[PDB]
RNA sequence: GCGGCGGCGGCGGCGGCGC
RNA sequence: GCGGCGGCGGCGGCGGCGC
């Protein structure tokens, strides 16, 4: 299937979290997201340290325009219902609506991923 | 119980609602928004015309503190689940946490239901 | 971090019924 | 707008199991 992401996942192994446990959610590696198109979802973890530069790459990982390209592989006549989801120290936000409305729905999702990216700490 | 909402209810009668229908979501009367404390959920429709006097009006609805003593009837040893709901115009965004996080779901949520209400037409 | 599992609650599509 | 209903899928608590 077509990914509606532009970088690839990036979860850590079983090792690499009970380390970062050790040494340190909070100051987790990084957030989940995902987006829902009908029953297929795609997912990614993504590592995330609170800096400038890393705000930047993170919010480089899907676009409008490609998860215009992926959701449209499960388009027709009826509506299907869409969905965005983020999960970062703590907090959980969900977008959702039809795909009707998709274009306005990408844009509440990336909105809400800037906001709790810089949640105060 | 005790509500987290500062502003009564403002759902439409059914006749309200067909006579908009006829004359004119998109331009919907107002939104809809919920907060949820383990299993009891507490809801609203209020009437929202997209001006700034109305936006002021209707982020007056719940506050930071409002809510943490809504809440807080039903705290205790365990942590329960704490989620704040708002649709508006065919899009839902959904904010859900822990009880230990509810300051930073009302600082979420806030922003999520600004953004939203502001969603460019 | 990942994969089951059992409860509880909410959310989005879809179809349909009542006011 | 409100109240059922049937599917499908997500999400949050909680408890527990595997890697």
Redesign the interface.
């Known amino acids: 299937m077509t990914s509606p992401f532009k970088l690839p996942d990036e979860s850590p192994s079983w090792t690499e979290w009970r380390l970062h446990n050790d040494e340190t959610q909070d100051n987790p590696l990084g957030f989940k997201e995902s987006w829902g198109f009908g029953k297929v979802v795609f997912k990614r973890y993504l590592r995330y340290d609170r800096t400038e530069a890393s705000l930047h790459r993170v919010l480089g990982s899907w676009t409008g325009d490609s998860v215009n390209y992926a959701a449209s592989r499960f388009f027709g006549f009826d509506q299907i219902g869409c969905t965005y989801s983020i999960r970062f120290?703590?907090?959980?936000?969900?977008?959702?609506?039809?795909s009707?409305?998709l274009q306005?729905?990408c844009?509440?999702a990336i909105?809400?991923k800037q906001?709790?990216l810089q949640?105060?700490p």
């Open positions: 120290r703590g907090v959980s936000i969900t977008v959702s609506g039809g009707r409305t306005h729905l844009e509440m909105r809400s906001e709790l949640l105060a």
